[PDB]
Ligand binder design. Structure first.
Ligand code: HEM
Ligand code: HEM
Ligand SMILES: CNCCN(C)c1cc(C#N)cc(CCc2cc(C)cc(N)n2)c1
Ligand SMILES: CNCCN(C)c1cc(C#N)cc(CCc2cc(C)cc(N)n2)c1
Ligand SMILES: C[C@H](O)[C@H](O)[C@H]1CNc2nc(N)[nH]c(=O)c2N1
Ligand SMILES: C[C@H](O)[C@H](O)[C@H]1CNc2nc(N)[nH]c(=O)c2N1
Ligand SMILES: [Zn+2]
Lengths: 404, 403
């Protein structure tokens, strides 16, 4: 009937229509001739319309659309742009935008929590030293001794001519990756380049599998400066298994706080190049991707040998059995250490509740099926059977090229 | 523009140029991707698709531009101009069907695409003959557990009449009996087709694994009911290699995965009844058919026998039971000497296929959400491989249920 994407849940048989995608201003990578949905990485007049659109979004969310404060906030932005080329956000606009960007993130399964985000304004920040203080404060608050709290810290926006604020690391917490003489990697292969960059900038490297990297923080038009995190601010969890007693002897560990620091937060055409955000982990991120990806820690064969599985034939499902127990260890160990974590079942169920909330609230929810479905036990989770529409809305978290 | 395709495990990059041969449009537009969606929402054009296919065929046999090529283009043109349609040579049909499987973006077993036994059944004029052709297919394809890929191709659609159809979605399906209290005994996916059979005079059973009869439909006639000889339907009882109690659950599955409701399009011609089969990948039985909430739904049952903590999600009881169920299927098929491929072996072979196809055609249409298995996704190499999805012809397509 309706001329919007028809969306079906194959487990439940139910149908919905996504009208929200009509509000998308930005084109994605697809066309009628081919689908590029599986790809990980595929001005004056322009600023105003983005600005006008965002202010419109803001006033709708507080229900004052068409009003005198609404049209005066418009006039105030259009004037400020007309005389300087840019404009500034009010505090409550920034809070709304940060939440809306998270709410808008198609690849995040944790969005049931979007409304509950602690926004630290750091738009006053004027040094790389100051950035470090804001970051330490964020970690302290967000970690909260294992009882994790979502947070974002927003540093000053891009300015015409003047250079960006950048955190060079991809996360606030990352393990070093050390390239060997043989060509292998000790630690995390994901973090090789950033480890090398930290050395180039004078860090004295360690040589463990789990060395917490220092931060490389860059203030406008300055070279980055190197900052070591005080070990006590960085909460970690040693991995053991609830029944396989040798698993603890493996020496495996992970950090409590997932904090993405290299993404750009865009609100009303304003670009916040340093806006680190954090939540808590879904257990498969650590147990499946970080610990079992071939190009990460790659511990599957090690664990399967300890489990005494037949690693000579695929048809033994030794990979499947090891991944299950590793994920179990991650969950059991975070639960033992009283550190917030969510398994892929709980997470996906809660995301299904989120889709229903948003269907009523906005008439749809942009969602990236390949990223939403967990990397183990996919069809065992309800999201596998849920069709999804993906599109870009703004405010948004966006990828940005590396500063170097 | 040509898409840049990256494997994130290896760091390697390819460029898909095969996608420019896509004459058909998919569900996506620049404004929104509709990739995870399962179903889709004149003599001049028939002749153009016919010219393009005939060209494809004569390119395959490396005899392009030849006398036979031109003479065959004349034949096709002449036949369309006069009758509004044309007919394929058996050799061309064989080519088209292989090319259809090759082009199927949702299929992980395309490494096998050149090895396909093609039965021409276009000399079929009754439901009775369809049943005959179908029984021979089943006998050939099953081959006492040494499965071989086959397609039987019934007469093409025609402007002036109803279609040949197999009403069943697969040649072998277990009945699904709706209960007064809403619940379903047997396979819930087959409630509707089980009900169509009963209405057309089938004596039902009361089992979980009752093999359905086939409803075969000759054009503009009511469909007829045909019961498959029990000896033609190879089935495998399920047991587990270390859990004695598993065999007691009485689980079983059939050996032959034979899809019978899709339409085969070759060079504009459409074949509405063209059942095809290969062999199972173990996750289709162990994960989807047996563990889907809306299928046989056996997770909890197995979890309890394993004495697992059903009470919470974080004990990963679902993951554990699912792995044992999949192992039971692989064990059982291996024990019965019936062809099957696990998801690791299957996806490794698909990576080799992508590579072969990158060299042969400059790309390979693939639907990532369907290629990546339903358990242990990132544990297989395809998870880390970017894929481009698009529609090439010849093709398999969905078509409406004929009722
Ligand atoms: C509160 C608990 C949270 C959970 C369980 C969660 C879960 C996830 C997961 C599993 C991913 C997939 C990425 C991967 O495969 O590694 C993801 C991505 C993402 N999350 Fe969340 N998240 C949470 C909080 C947040 C917060 C607070 C924000 C920002 C305010 C956020 C924004 C994003 C964004 C932008 C992505 C996409 C990242 C990319 O494309 O690389 N998430 N999240
Ligand atoms: C030879 C062994 C084969 C294996 C292991 C295999 C495996 C698979 C799998 C796992 C799927 C996804 C189905 C699902 O998840 O439910 C699939 C889909 C498909 N396969 Fe294959 N296949 C094989 C042979 C064939 C053959 C012989 C043909 C046709 C001549 C074919 C054509 C297709 C088509 C058209 C689909 C899409 C089905 C749909 O859209 O619902 N396959 N295959
Ligand atoms: C580990 N597999 C790949 C996942 N990827 C590519 C990935 C890369 C980066 C970065 N930088 C960041 C993420 C998001 C992880 C995340 C973020 C937040 C706020 C919460 C959470 N639970 N996970 C995911
Ligand atoms: C439980 N998963 C089902 C996915 N679906 C909807 C699905 C529907 C139909 C049909 N008609 C067919 C399939 C594929 C079955 C199949 C076909 C072939 C040739 C080989 C094979 N191993 N499996 C899958
Ligand atoms: C090729 C494919 O897009 C890529 O491997 C994706 C698949 N799905 C994912 N899903 C999540 N959540 N995170 C990822 O990094 C990926 N990687
Ligand atoms: C909604 C979603 O696209 C749907 O459940 C798909 C996901 N991927 C799949 N993949 C395969 N191989 N078979 C399927 O049935 C499905 N189902
Ligand atoms: Zn798409």
């Amino acid at each position: 009937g309706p001329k919007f994407p028809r969306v079906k849940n194959w487990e439940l048989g139910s149908i919905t229509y996504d009208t929200l995608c009509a509000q998308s201003q930005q084109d994605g990578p697809c066309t009628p001739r081919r689908c590029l949905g599986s790809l990980v990485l595929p001005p004056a007049e322009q600023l105003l319309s983005q600005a006008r659109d965002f202010i419109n979004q803001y006033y709708s969310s507080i229900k004052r659309s068409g009003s005198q404060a609404h049209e005066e906030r418009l006039q105030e932005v259009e004037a400020e742009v007309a005389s300087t080329g840019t404009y500034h956000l009010r505090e409550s606009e920034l809070v709304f935008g940060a939440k809306q960007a998270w709410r808008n993130a198609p690849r995040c399964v944790g969005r049931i929590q979007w409304g509950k985000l602690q926004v630290f304004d750091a738009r006053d920040c004027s040094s790389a030293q100051e950035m470090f203080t804001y970051i330490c404060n964020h970690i302290k608050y967000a970690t909260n001794r294992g009882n994790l709290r979502s947070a974002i810290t927003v540093f000053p926006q891009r300015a015409p001519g003047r250079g960006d604020f950048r955190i060079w690391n991809s996360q606030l917490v990352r393990y070093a990756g050390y390239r060997q003489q043989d060509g292998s990697v000790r630690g995390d292969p994901a973090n090789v380049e950033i480890t090398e960059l930290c050395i180039q900038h004078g860090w004295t490297p360690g040589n463990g599998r789990f060395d917490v990297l220092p931060l490389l923080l860059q203030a406008p038009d300055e070279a980055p400066e190197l900052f070591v995190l005080p070990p006590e601010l960085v909460l970690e969890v040693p991995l053991e298994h609830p029944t396989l007693e040798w698993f603890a002897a493996l020496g495996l560990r992970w950090y409590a706080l997932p904090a993405v620091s290299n993404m750009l937060l865009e609100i009303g055409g304003l670009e916040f190049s340093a806006a680190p955000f954090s939540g808590w982990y879904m257990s498969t991120e650590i147990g499946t991707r970080n610990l079992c990806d071939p190009h990460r820690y790659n511990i599957l064969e090690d664990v399967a040998v300890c489990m005494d599985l037949d690693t000579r034939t695929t048809s033994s499902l030794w990979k499947d059995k090891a991944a299950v127990e590793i994920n179990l260890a991650v969950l059991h160990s975070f639960q033992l250490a009283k550190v917030t974590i969510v398994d892929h079942h709980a997470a996906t169920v809660s995301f299904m509740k989120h889709l229903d909330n948003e269907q009523k609230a906005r008439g749809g929810c942009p969602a990236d099926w390949a990223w939403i479905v967990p990397p183990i036990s996919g069809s065992l989770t309800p999201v596998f059977h849920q069709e999804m529409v993906n599109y870009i809305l703004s405010p948004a978290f966006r990828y940005q090229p590396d500063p170097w």
